[PDB]
Amino acid sequence: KLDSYTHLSFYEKRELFRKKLREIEGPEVTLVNEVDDEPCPSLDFQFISQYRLTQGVIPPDPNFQSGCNCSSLGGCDLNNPSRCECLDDLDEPTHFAYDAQGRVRADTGAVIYECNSFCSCSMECPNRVVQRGRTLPLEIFKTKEKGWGVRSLRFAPAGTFITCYLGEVITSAEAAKRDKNYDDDGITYLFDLDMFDDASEYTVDAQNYGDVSRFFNHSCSPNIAIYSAVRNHGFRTIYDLAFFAIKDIQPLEELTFDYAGAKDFSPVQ
Ligand code: NI
Ligand SMILES: [Zn+2]
Ligand SMILES: [Zn+2]
Ligand SMILES: [Zn+2]
Numbered sequence: 001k002l003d004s005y006t007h008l009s010f011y012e013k014r015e016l017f018r019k020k021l022r023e024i025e026g027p028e029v030t031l032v033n034e035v036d037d038e039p040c041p042s043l044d045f046q047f048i049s050q051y052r053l054t055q056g057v058i059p060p061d062p063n064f065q066s067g068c069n070c071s072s073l074g075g076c077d078l079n080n081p082s083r084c085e086c087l088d089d090l091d092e093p094t095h096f097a098y099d100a101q102g103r104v105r106a107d108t109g110a111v112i113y114e115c116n117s118f119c120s121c122s123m124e125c126p127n128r129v130v131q132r133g134r135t136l137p138l139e140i141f142k143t144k145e146k147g148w149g150v151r152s153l154r155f156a157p158a159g160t161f162i163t164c165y166l167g168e169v170i171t172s173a174e175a176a177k178r179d180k181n182y183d184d185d186g187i188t189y190l191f192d193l194d195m196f197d198d199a200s201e202y203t204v205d206a207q208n209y210g211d212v213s214r215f216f217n218h219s220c221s222p223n224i225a226i227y228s229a230v231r232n233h234g235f236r237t238i239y240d241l242a243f244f245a246i247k248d249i250q251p252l253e254e255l256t257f258d259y260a261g262a263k264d265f266s267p268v269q
Helices: 006-020 172-179
Strands: 028-030 111-113 138-142 146-153 161-164 168-171 190-192 202-205 224-230 242-243
Touching: 146 242, 161 202, 172 190, 172 202
Parallel strands: 028 138, 111 224
Antiparallel strands: 138 146, 161 242, 168 202, 190 202, 224 242
């Protein structure tokens, strides 16, 4: 029932959005809508691949970073949990967060310690998974009862990294400033960085800048969950929000999460 002008307008709007995704550095990201005639999600936002810092936020200084030099040939050898200085932040059931497959081990907690730029290992160091980025080709699609969602296009073994939740790092102060502006917003892309000390009170907002994950939906039976991966082991005022698959993800399966913090990880209870 759309008239020529509108129909063309929508056409062009969807194509613009597809253009925008083509410019994402990484595996493919596609846009589909088999439900209605909505072109695509709002274009008023920019895809990024690194946090965008904002006024008033003091980022962890890299200058005071610890760098492991336990890089023999390959990476750091996942058999030497007692050689890395990236792991010195805790010694109990000591081990690298990942296995050989690059998947997140089942005995790994809600905290991942990856190698820094101050380490001597190459980018292939088995302890630089998150840093390497997405590897799964994803598709933004229109769900029937919920807004837009994202499903995988490939099978993902539980424990597979997916992507970090990117966006502007704002102080819980301005956070609330924006909360005073959220009108009839169906979704409010806020993510508090309070895994540790609550003094920093920093939050990630993907309202205007973010990653594909800014399209992920909440759910009760999620297939992905946040893993606080840190590189500046000494200052966790800011860290990476990593999404890993908690269970096998079937191709074309929608990805969903529900942050519970370290209050769903370490407890079988
Ligand atoms: Ni089409
Ligand atoms: Zn190491
Ligand atoms: Zn290291
Ligand atoms: Zn390393």
